Symmetry: D3
Subunit: 180 residues, 6 copies
Amino acid sequence: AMESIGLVEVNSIARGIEAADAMLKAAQVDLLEAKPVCPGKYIVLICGDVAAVQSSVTAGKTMAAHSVLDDFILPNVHPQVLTAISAATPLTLIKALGIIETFSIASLIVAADTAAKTGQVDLVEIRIGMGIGGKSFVTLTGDVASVESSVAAGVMLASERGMLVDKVVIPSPHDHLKRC
Amino acid sequence: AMESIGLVEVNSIARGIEAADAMLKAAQVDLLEAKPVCPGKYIVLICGDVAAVQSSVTAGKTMAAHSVLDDFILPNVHPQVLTAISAATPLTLIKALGIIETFSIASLIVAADTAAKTGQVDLVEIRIGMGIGGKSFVTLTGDVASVESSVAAGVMLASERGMLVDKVVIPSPHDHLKRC
Amino acid sequence: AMESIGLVEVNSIARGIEAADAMLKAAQVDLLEAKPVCPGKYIVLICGDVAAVQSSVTAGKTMAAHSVLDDFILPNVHPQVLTAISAATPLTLIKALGIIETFSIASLIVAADTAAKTGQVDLVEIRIGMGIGGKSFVTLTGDVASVESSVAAGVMLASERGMLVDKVVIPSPHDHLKRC
Amino acid sequence: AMESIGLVEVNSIARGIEAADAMLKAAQVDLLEAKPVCPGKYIVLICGDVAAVQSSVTAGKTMAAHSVLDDFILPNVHPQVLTAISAATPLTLIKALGIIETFSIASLIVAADTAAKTGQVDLVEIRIGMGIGGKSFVTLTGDVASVESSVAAGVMLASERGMLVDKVVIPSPHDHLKRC
Amino acid sequence: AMESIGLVEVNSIARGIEAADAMLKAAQVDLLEAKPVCPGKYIVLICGDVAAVQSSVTAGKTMAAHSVLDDFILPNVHPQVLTAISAATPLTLIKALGIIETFSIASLIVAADTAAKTGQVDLVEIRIGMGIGGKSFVTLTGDVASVESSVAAGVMLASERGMLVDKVVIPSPHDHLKRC
Amino acid sequence: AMESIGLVEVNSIARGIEAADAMLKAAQVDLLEAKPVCPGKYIVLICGDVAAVQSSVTAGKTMAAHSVLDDFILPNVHPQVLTAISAATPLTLIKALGIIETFSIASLIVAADTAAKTGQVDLVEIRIGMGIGGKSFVTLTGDVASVESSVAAGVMLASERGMLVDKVVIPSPHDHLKRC
């Protein structure tokens, strides 16, 4: 089995911190992200096995109750999505550069995961948050054809749901773009 | 005599900086905080004796005039409120964890001060600001009963005025919550 | 010839990054600033010769298309505006302190440039952005008369266009204002 | 009773971390500082009551054994020494500026404490460490006569023991020195 | 096949940067670390397949020539050693805490790798460098018996070669040690 | 006239801070750098007109007396040396990459200045200090021939005086070297 990712979005820092406590305790899950985002959201991201993430997410929904804004689970998430989120992808020689930008963290996770699952790309970074808009984004590289079809796929779902801000493929990025 | 705390909130950075200059000059007061908060507020927090804080606050209200959004004074403020604000509370062994979160800096000061004044807690941190919402919060620890009755008291006033976002008491915080 | 400054404001990070790539490639220009500002804008600032900046700005407008929020060019910009923007003005003994604060980056550039062009002041800093409001500001020093007439001039244009938040001249700034 | 301060210096990070664990557990003491300093020292600073600090220091000496380089205790330490060490002295209007610089952390604590105990000064900062030399220093302000006699006293002990690097009193510090 | 790790230590920043350039170019390897350490060393750490790391290391030794201080290769390195080095191990619930500290980066890599290979521990962090001494260290957690036998094994080789500074197992770390 | 650069190196932080105060006061000079470097040096770098820098340097030598380790003045310094030192060179497209590394800050200034004065290069950065060794370095770019003859010239003087650690010209730097 591959791991799952779970997300709870909460209206309060206070409640978000209590929800995070519940989520960590509920089952064997690792914390990826617990932080205040755009006003005045608090988000919790965790990863573990399918069933472990499901208990953890229910636990947080239980504690947070009416201040839950969103909860989401993506089973069989691509390993690179997790490392990217945890600001931990190794230095990658960037070739062609793709960027997907969505209105919600859930749609971003879906897009990043779909992107990574198609062909030969490496995710470069994921930005949940980040002060503010609520806009999140993923960047990736590979040869131009690989990147092109990876962002087109990464975008299919998000666009249908009106969650997609925009995307770009930049084939030969200027060096002040590799000066990330 | 115990010290007082004074707050001026201003619509401009420019005016806020001029107001802060007036406030520092007006009387023997110390500056706790002078910073831009949520759009596009500038806040000034100062502390000194009752009468000194009163002159300082009037001075700022004088300079800032129509771009004042709020001015506030809390006499006989608990020493821990001040150290907490000035990001200066020593490392405290966190036992049970209480958090109060309010819509305004004034209501937060009142809540933190009332919390500290009731029983045996230590305030852990205060966050004015902080990008954004305008939401502020206080965290504190102690044994569970002490914390429970300290946040209930800290909350009484704020809730009546519709300034209270929320609160939590977490009796046995997970270690990734002591990883503050 | 003195250099020009060009600005493109874009609705997406993704598009903003693609626009920046186009702008750098279009002609011999230097990048001053490329960054996400208030929700969910991305801004690009560049400098070079008149004609070089014009090509660069058209290039970005070309790539960014309907997600352009603003594009602007200021020819014969004062050298101090550029160094101030690039967070690079040397330590300056601050005498009298002037601050201009505007609702748009364009109006700020105009105001800073007009300020620097009048009499004997040194710009101290420029803040584009900066989380959030969209409010930008310039600070400058000199003797009191020089600063007074430099901000009055720096403000003329901005005020007529309803782009001016406010300004202050502080003749003898308190030392916790020289503690910038 | 006023509080005491205790210091253990250890040859290893590993041992220093174990010593710190012992020290925190030994008695009701607060941790001020636990950090690697010049090669390859680890230092622990704690504060509490006389007897509590004595148990804590013995505990660390017990765990650290032959990798102890120095242990020290200063009873009835001036409250300002503690706040200064914990990087927590409020913004202070600096008038005349005194600086004492010693070869050892112990001699610095003694000097800072003696300085604070004489007349009307406020300690501004203490730097243990700090990469490297092993040199530590204290800065303080007040009127010129107060500062002059406070550093002369702060220096008496240190100089006799050949632990004193040097000191200065700067009566009217340039503003780029108040730009601390 | 599992990956290998290669290290080149160079006497100059200048030469170290040239060596790093050679190493990256020589074969498909990823850069883990390229940085100045204690005076005036520059270190390069890379990872890839056995043969790729061997070419990369020879390349750096070629460019750096007489300013090479050390070169080292560890085949079949434990995946956790790499993630730990690249400051990228996820938040781990620390139980019992082990620390190994050595005089050389090579001996540290060997010790960390041997530690991770024995029983059920998770490496928490690795510190190459770090200003200064040249001392490096690894921390790990698990239950007490697992950690005890993992550091004893991690230490065997290093101690025989006089490269071992020291080690500790702390069974129940104080919470200000989980405040890492 | 072009500006000069002056350097005073002092044995104490305390004395170095007093020397810096004297230097700033002595004449119309700007402060470039005032900071503790390798154990336990404090360095002051200033720039202004020839005669102004000469007064400033004599002033510091006067205050610092026997704790002066070095004083130096370089007349008609290249504008790029100053901007490079003040961490303020704009983003430069790096082509071929040259690096000069010397044992003393004086020899570095001389080398950087000679480098910039020969042909068409742009200095990229200067690192005085920097923890530790006392080793300083300059990086520059241009086409390969320009860089080659600029570092050869930049090195002539330093090598004769045994102050030169080393240099490199890297014609096609790997992208993780443009990831500066």
